[PDB]
Amino acid sequence: VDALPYFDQGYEAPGVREAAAALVEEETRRYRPTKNYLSYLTAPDYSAFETDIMRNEFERLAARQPIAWQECVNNSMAQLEHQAVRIENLELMSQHGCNAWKVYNENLVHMIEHAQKELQKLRKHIQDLNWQRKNMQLTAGSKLREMESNWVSLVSKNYEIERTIVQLENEIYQIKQQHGEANKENIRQDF
């Protein structure tokens, strides 16, 4: 159950690409129900339970659908009063200044600096974790290499006693009949 991406460098992205998704496509082709993902995303959903009301439903229908004696003095007097209020607001705004665009710009610069610091810290932590995983993968790789070499040497040691044991039975018969007491015992000699 231990496979490191850095363990085998020869095959990573092309290593499992086609055939892996072909077997996974064979199991998914056999059956593909939904349990853990649908059950995990089922409770929070997106917007389901709360749904709000009023402007939520009217705004949803608006989302699916991209689409006189007094009246003269009413809109006229309202235009005059609105023009006077706008003249007062422009008189104050032009009478003072701004400075808030530069202040808020400096604040946004500070926030961007904090975000960059957080990203740097996260990158540092990820780098440390990748370093530790690389060291562990190196140790396990060396141990696995020594294990495979020890297995090959073990198979060669057993095969060495095999062949030399067969030649020990043939030569056991040769010396047997030439010396070797009688031929009974040494002909039955085997590993």
């Binding site: 696995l144 040497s153 040691k157 057993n158």
Partner: protein, 43 residues
């Protein structure tokens, strides 16, 4: 975090496989030791 988790947790499986290969290496080496020892003493 999960990669290092499962990797470090499943590393004793590979280490135990190495210990098993070393154990079989000692078994085959001992069997060859007694086999070729008796074969050398049979001369």
């Amino acid at each position: 975090e999960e990669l290092k988790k499962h990797e470090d947790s499943a590393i004793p499986r590979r280490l135990e496989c190495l210990k098993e290969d070393v154990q079989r290496q000692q078994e085959r080496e001992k069997e060859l030791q007694h086999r070729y020892a008796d074969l050398l003493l049979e001369k």
